[PDB]
Amino acid sequence: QRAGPNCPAGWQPLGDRCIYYETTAMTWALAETNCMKLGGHLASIHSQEEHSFIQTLNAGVVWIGGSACLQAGAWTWSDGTPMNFRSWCSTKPDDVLAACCMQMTAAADQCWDDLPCPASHKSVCAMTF
């Protein structure tokens, strides 16, 4: 008798860790809110190939990077520090109040590009224990 796979319940312990995914267009507001109630936040990437994962699914854009709309040139994670690895294309254009919620389109040629926040795109959430 040894009950204990990975996650507790109402989650998705794919492999070992725990991650979530959706399809219906639900931006930061719709995603983050529902995601918060679950227990986690907008997933991220490190192994790179994992980035290919969300790109392989294809279901809109993915809100993953953080946010910046109350400082002078300061981009970080959702609520921490910044990341690395990103040689898709040149740096994002502009960086004023015009955009507050970062965004990485998913057209293959769209390349990363900040957004103003309203753009109901699929949700990509991850988590651990």
mmCIF file with all atom_site columns, N, CA and C in Angstrom, residues 21-26 53-62 106 119-124:
data_model
loop_
_atom_site.group_PDB
_atom_site.id
_atom_site.type_symbol
_atom_site.label_atom_id
_atom_site.label_alt_id
_atom_site.label_comp_id
_atom_site.label_asym_id
_atom_site.label_entity_id
_atom_site.label_seq_id
_atom_site.pdbx_PDB_ins_code
_atom_site.Cartn_x
_atom_site.Cartn_y
_atom_site.Cartn_z
_atom_site.occupancy
_atom_site.B_iso_or_equiv
_atom_site.pdbx_formal_charge
_atom_site.auth_seq_id
_atom_site.auth_comp_id
_atom_site.auth_asym_id
_atom_site.auth_atom_id
_atom_site.pdbx_PDB_model_num
ATOM 1  N N  . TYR A 1 21  ? -2.923  22.409 -19.526 1.00 0.00 ? 21  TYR A N  1
ATOM 2  C CA . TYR A 1 21  ? -3.025  22.932 -20.886 1.00 0.00 ? 21  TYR A CA 1
ATOM 3  C C  . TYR A 1 21  ? -4.490  23.103 -21.270 1.00 0.00 ? 21  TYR A C  1
ATOM 4  N N  . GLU A 1 22  ? -4.751  24.032 -22.184 1.00 0.00 ? 22  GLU A N  1
ATOM 5  C CA . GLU A 1 22  ? -6.118  24.273 -22.625 1.00 0.00 ? 22  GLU A CA 1
ATOM 6  C C  . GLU A 1 22  ? -6.153  24.512 -24.131 1.00 0.00 ? 22  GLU A C  1
ATOM 7  N N  . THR A 1 23  ? -7.319  24.913 -24.625 1.00 0.00 ? 23  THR A N  1
ATOM 8  C CA . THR A 1 23  ? -7.483  25.168 -26.054 1.00 0.00 ? 23  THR A CA 1
ATOM 9  C C  . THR A 1 23  ? -8.344  26.404 -26.279 1.00 0.00 ? 23  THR A C  1
ATOM 10 N N  . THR A 1 24  ? -9.451  26.491 -25.540 1.00 0.00 ? 24  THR A N  1
ATOM 11 C CA . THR A 1 24  ? -10.354 27.635 -25.663 1.00 0.00 ? 24  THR A CA 1
ATOM 12 C C  . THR A 1 24  ? -9.601  28.937 -25.396 1.00 0.00 ? 24  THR A C  1
ATOM 13 N N  . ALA A 1 25  ? -9.820  29.921 -26.260 1.00 0.00 ? 25  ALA A N  1
ATOM 14 C CA . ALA A 1 25  ? -9.151  31.209 -26.125 1.00 0.00 ? 25  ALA A CA 1
ATOM 15 C C  . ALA A 1 25  ? -9.463  31.851 -24.772 1.00 0.00 ? 25  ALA A C  1
ATOM 16 N N  . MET A 1 26  ? -8.444  31.909 -23.922 1.00 0.00 ? 26  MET A N  1
ATOM 17 C CA . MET A 1 26  ? -8.583  32.515 -22.601 1.00 0.00 ? 26  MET A CA 1
ATOM 18 C C  . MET A 1 26  ? -7.274  33.180 -22.223 1.00 0.00 ? 26  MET A C  1
ATOM 19 N N  . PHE A 1 53  ? 7.078   21.985 -27.200 1.00 0.00 ? 53  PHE A N  1
ATOM 20 C CA . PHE A 1 53  ? 5.864   21.292 -26.759 1.00 0.00 ? 53  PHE A CA 1
ATOM 21 C C  . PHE A 1 53  ? 4.617   22.145 -26.997 1.00 0.00 ? 53  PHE A C  1
ATOM 22 N N  . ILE A 1 54  ? 4.579   23.317 -26.368 1.00 0.00 ? 54  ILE A N  1
ATOM 23 C CA . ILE A 1 54  ? 3.433   24.211 -26.513 1.00 0.00 ? 54  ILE A CA 1
ATOM 24 C C  . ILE A 1 54  ? 3.244   24.625 -27.972 1.00 0.00 ? 54  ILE A C  1
ATOM 25 N N  . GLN A 1 55  ? 4.353   24.744 -28.696 1.00 0.00 ? 55  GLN A N  1
ATOM 26 C CA . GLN A 1 55  ? 4.294   25.131 -30.106 1.00 0.00 ? 55  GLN A CA 1
ATOM 27 C C  . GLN A 1 55  ? 3.739   23.986 -30.953 1.00 0.00 ? 55  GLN A C  1
ATOM 28 N N  . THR A 1 56  ? 3.979   22.755 -30.502 1.00 0.00 ? 56  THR A N  1
ATOM 29 C CA . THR A 1 56  ? 3.505   21.579 -31.230 1.00 0.00 ? 56  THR A CA 1
ATOM 30 C C  . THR A 1 56  ? 1.990   21.430 -31.092 1.00 0.00 ? 56  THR A C  1
ATOM 31 N N  . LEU A 1 57  ? 1.454   21.895 -29.967 1.00 0.00 ? 57  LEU A N  1
ATOM 32 C CA . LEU A 1 57  ? 0.016   21.799 -29.726 1.00 0.00 ? 57  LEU A CA 1
ATOM 33 C C  . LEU A 1 57  ? -0.745  22.780 -30.614 1.00 0.00 ? 57  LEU A C  1
ATOM 34 N N  . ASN A 1 58  ? -0.302  24.034 -30.610 1.00 0.00 ? 58  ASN A N  1
ATOM 35 C CA . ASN A 1 58  ? -0.945  25.069 -31.421 1.00 0.00 ? 58  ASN A CA 1
ATOM 36 C C  . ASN A 1 58  ? -2.409  25.242 -31.020 1.00 0.00 ? 58  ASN A C  1
ATOM 37 N N  . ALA A 1 59  ? -2.712  26.390 -30.420 1.00 0.00 ? 59  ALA A N  1
ATOM 38 C CA . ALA A 1 59  ? -4.080  26.679 -29.990 1.00 0.00 ? 59  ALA A CA 1
ATOM 39 C C  . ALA A 1 59  ? -4.217  28.157 -29.619 1.00 0.00 ? 59  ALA A C  1
ATOM 40 N N  . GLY A 1 60  ? -3.471  29.003 -30.323 1.00 0.00 ? 60  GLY A N  1
ATOM 41 C CA . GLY A 1 60  ? -3.506  30.441 -30.057 1.00 0.00 ? 60  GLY A CA 1
ATOM 42 C C  . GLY A 1 60  ? -2.145  30.906 -29.552 1.00 0.00 ? 60  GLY A C  1
ATOM 43 N N  . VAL A 1 61  ? -2.137  31.959 -28.737 1.00 0.00 ? 61  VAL A N  1
ATOM 44 C CA . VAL A 1 61  ? -0.869  32.460 -28.199 1.00 0.00 ? 61  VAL A CA 1
ATOM 45 C C  . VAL A 1 61  ? -0.691  31.940 -26.772 1.00 0.00 ? 61  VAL A C  1
ATOM 46 N N  . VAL A 1 62  ? 0.500   32.120 -26.209 1.00 0.00 ? 62  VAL A N  1
ATOM 47 C CA . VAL A 1 62  ? 0.763   31.638 -24.858 1.00 0.00 ? 62  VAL A CA 1
ATOM 48 C C  . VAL A 1 62  ? 1.308   32.766 -23.997 1.00 0.00 ? 62  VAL A C  1
ATOM 49 N N  . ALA A 1 106 ? 2.107   32.771 -31.822 1.00 0.00 ? 106 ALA A N  1
ATOM 50 C CA . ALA A 1 106 ? 2.422   31.409 -32.244 1.00 0.00 ? 106 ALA A CA 1
ATOM 51 C C  . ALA A 1 106 ? 2.093   31.163 -33.724 1.00 0.00 ? 106 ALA A C  1
ATOM 52 N N  . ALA A 1 119 ? -6.318  39.690 -25.538 1.00 0.00 ? 119 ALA A N  1
ATOM 53 C CA . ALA A 1 119 ? -6.100  38.850 -26.707 1.00 0.00 ? 119 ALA A CA 1
ATOM 54 C C  . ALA A 1 119 ? -6.290  37.400 -26.298 1.00 0.00 ? 119 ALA A C  1
ATOM 55 N N  . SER A 1 120 ? -7.546  37.051 -26.064 1.00 0.00 ? 120 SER A N  1
ATOM 56 C CA . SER A 1 120 ? -7.909  35.706 -25.621 1.00 0.00 ? 120 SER A CA 1
ATOM 57 C C  . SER A 1 120 ? -7.184  34.612 -26.396 1.00 0.00 ? 120 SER A C  1
ATOM 58 N N  . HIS A 1 121 ? -6.096  34.166 -25.800 1.00 0.00 ? 121 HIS A N  1
ATOM 59 C CA . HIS A 1 121 ? -5.273  33.125 -26.359 1.00 0.00 ? 121 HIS A CA 1
ATOM 60 C C  . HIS A 1 121 ? -5.251  31.936 -25.402 1.00 0.00 ? 121 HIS A C  1
ATOM 61 N N  . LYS A 1 122 ? -4.989  30.735 -25.932 1.00 0.00 ? 122 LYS A N  1
ATOM 62 C CA . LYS A 1 122 ? -4.966  29.519 -25.095 1.00 0.00 ? 122 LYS A CA 1
ATOM 63 C C  . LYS A 1 122 ? -4.171  29.742 -23.812 1.00 0.00 ? 122 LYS A C  1
ATOM 64 N N  . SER A 1 123 ? -4.338  28.831 -22.857 1.00 0.00 ? 123 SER A N  1
ATOM 65 C CA . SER A 1 123 ? -3.640  28.955 -21.584 1.00 0.00 ? 123 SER A CA 1
ATOM 66 C C  . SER A 1 123 ? -2.618  27.841 -21.417 1.00 0.00 ? 123 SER A C  1
ATOM 67 N N  . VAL A 1 124 ? -1.461  28.215 -20.891 1.00 0.00 ? 124 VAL A N  1
ATOM 68 C CA . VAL A 1 124 ? -0.385  27.262 -20.663 1.00 0.00 ? 124 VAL A CA 1
ATOM 69 C C  . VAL A 1 124 ? 0.102   27.392 -19.222 1.00 0.00 ? 124 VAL A C  1
#
